[PDB]
């Protein structure tokens, strides 16, 4: 009753869904009781997985994604993760990273996810625009969520969310959706003059 291993979480998933986890396209390991604390090499058996659900656990470090040859959506929201790292093994295929409600303050390492289209990271610990500049390397990034980070809250509490959206699009000119709302043509134009 301290921590659930990946192996044990897979058995719970297979009992709830009646699919062999090695065959499954969506592997649901979220919300284990007790929480998962460590990713491990059992994840390498999940060769068919396109959507790995590991949200609502107590994972502290990203690791052990080697062997997930089809992984397209990596869901790690509501864990204890501080650093974006150890993602080279899925960089060729990963299109969405869902990692809201973690403890990420630096986006160093996000640049490896060259095919990323969607990044959800509400309620993390981003405090400065220098972190958002690191996202400009992602040529396919279309959908971004920053609500609840200190940097977002700074602007929200001063009734300046419009200024915050311009700061984002200034750095990410091709972004299509921000915090669930489309980037409109007037926001792009203001961002173009600000840039």
């Amino acid at each position: 009753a301290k921590a659930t291993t990946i192996k044990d979480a897979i058995r719970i998933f297979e009992e709830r869904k009646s699919v062999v986890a090695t065959e499954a396209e969506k592997v649901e390991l979220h919300g284990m009781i007790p929480p998962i604390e460590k990713m491990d090499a059992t994840l390498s058996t999940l060769k068919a997985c396109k959507h790995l659900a590991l949200s609502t656990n107590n994972i502290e470090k990203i690791s052990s994604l080697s062997g997930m040859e089809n992984l397209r959506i990596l869901s790690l929201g509501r864990n204890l993760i501080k650093k974006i790292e150890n993602l080279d093994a899925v960089a060729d295929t990963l299109e969405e990273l869902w990692i809201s409600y973690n403890q990420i303050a630096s986006l160093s390492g996000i640049e490896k996810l060259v095919n990323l289209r969607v990044l959800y990271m509400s309620n993390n610990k981003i405090t400065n625009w220098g972190e958002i500049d690191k996202l400009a390397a992602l040529d396919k990034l279309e959908d971004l969520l920053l609500a609840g980070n200190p940097l977002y809250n700074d602007y929200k509490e001063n009734n300046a969310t419009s200024e915050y959206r311009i700061e984002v699009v200034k750095r990410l000119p091709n972004l299509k959706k921000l915090d669930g709302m489309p980037v409109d043509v007037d926001e792009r134009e203001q961002a173009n003059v600000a840039r």
């Binding site: 979220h30 919300g31 009781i33 007790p34 929480p35 659900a53 949200s55 609502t56 656990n57 107590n58 869901s75 929201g77 509501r78 864990n79 204890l80 869902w98 809201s100 409600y101 959800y120 509400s122 309620n123 969520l145 609500a147 609840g148 669930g180 709302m181």
Partner: protein, 138 residues
């Protein structure tokens, strides 16, 4: 379009009166299940919830709710209208996945929550209906 889910969401909010929120504030300690109900509202609104963490409630392990953040939400006089105004079309897939652990608990039902706290238990139906709306609308 998912009008049965949206109809249930609106019935849920219309079942809650301002006096219900007042009386809930008057409790020194809320029933544990109501803190999880409000966590579902916090998740949909992208407000703070605490780490995954469990406590024994009537013989089952259930998530510890972030009730102080729920109180902050309830201390805004616009709270109920804010839920009526909620932009359902902006729910994303991650938010639905973060709700599912609450719905996984055998005791997380309107009947059980209503027995504990009355009309405010409608927020359980509101949260489940928003998730149902999102899953249908795509």
């Amino acid at each position: 379009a998912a009008k049965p889910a949206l109809d249930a969401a609106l019935e849920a909010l219309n079942s809650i009166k301002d006096g219900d929120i007042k009386n809930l504030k008057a409790l020194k300690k809320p029933p544990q299940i109501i803190t999880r109900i409000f966590d579902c509202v916090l998740v949909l609104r992208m407000l703070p919830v605490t780490k995954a963490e469990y406590t024994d409630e009537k013989g089952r392990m259930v998530q510890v709710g972030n009730y102080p953040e729920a109180q902050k939400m309830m201390n805004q006089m616009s709270f109920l209208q804010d839920l009526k105004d909620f932009a359902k079309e902006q729910i994303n897939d991650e938010t639905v996945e973060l709700l599912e652990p609450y719905f996984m608990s055998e005791d997380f039902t309107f009947e059980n929550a209503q027995k504990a706290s009355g009309n405010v238990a409608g927020l359980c139906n509101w949260a489940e209906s928003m998730a149902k709306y999102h899953n249908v609308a795509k």
